[PDB]
Paper text:
As a proof of concept, we enhanced the stability of a marginally stable designed protein (called dF106) through conventional directed evolution. dF106 was created in an effort to computationally redesign the ubiquitous Rossmann fold of thioredoxins using Rosetta Design. Using the CPOP system, dF106 variants were selected, genetically resulting in a protein variant dF106-L11P-D83V, henceforth termed enhanced dF106 (edF106). This had a high stability with a folding energy of −48 kJ/mol. Crystal structures of stabilized variants showed small perturbations in helices 1 and 2, which rendered them closer in structure to the redesign template.
We therefore introduced the 15 substitutions predicted to be most stabilizing by the GMMA into the isolated edF106 protein to measure their individual as well as combined effects on thermodynamic stability. The top 15 substitutions are found at nine distinct positions, with some positions having two or three substitutions that GMMA suggests are stabilizing. Thus, only nine could be combined to form the multi-mutant 9 (MM9) variant. All the same, the MM9 variant had a stability of −68.6 ± 1.1 kJ/mol (ΔΔG = −21.8 ± 1.1 kJ/mol, n = 5) and an extrapolated melting temperature of 152°C ± 10°C (n = 5). To gain more insight into the effects of the mutations, we crystalized and determined the crystal structure of MM9 using diffraction data that extended to a resolution at 1.9 Å. However, there was no visible electron density to fit the N-proximal residues (1–17). Instead, a strong crystal contact was present on the exposed surface and had likely moved the 17-residue helix (α1) out of the way. The crystals grew very slowly, typically within a month, with a low success rate out of 48 examined crystallization conditions. Only one or two would yield crystals indicative of a conformational change taking place in order to stabilize the crystal lattice. The structure also revealed that the destabilizing substitution E54Y presented in MM9, but not in eMM9, would probably be incompatible with the native conformation of Val2, which may have facilitated its increased dynamics following MM9 crystal formation.
Residue numbers in the entry: 18 to 105
Write the structure that this text describes.
């Protein structure tokens, strides 16, 4: 399954909308993708590995490889279109 990972900071107002969007897509594509939520402060080594410095950031992985990274202003349509790409 393709994987979508939300990198988040705890007290972040814009991160709230992206977290809603990601959870919405997680349900919409349940069973077809896996979604993980990484707290930058609780897991700094993962954020460091993936060069995550701003939050919210959403990354996509497939076949154990990093495929794309979205930062800054993030929309549901952007994320959904990536999900569809890796589903075929």
């Amino acid at each position: 399954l393709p994987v979508m990972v939300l990198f988040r900071k705890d007290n972040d107002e814009e991160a709230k909308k992206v977290e809603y969007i990601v959870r919405e897509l997680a349900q919409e594509f349940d069973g077809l993708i896996r979604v993980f939520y990484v707290d930058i402060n609780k897991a700094p080594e993962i954020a460091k590995k993936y060069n995550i410095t701003t939050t919210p950031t959403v990354a996509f992985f497939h076949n154990g490889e990093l495929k794309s990274v979205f930062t800054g202003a993030i929309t549901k349509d952007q994320l959904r279109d990536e999900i569809l790409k890796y589903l075929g």
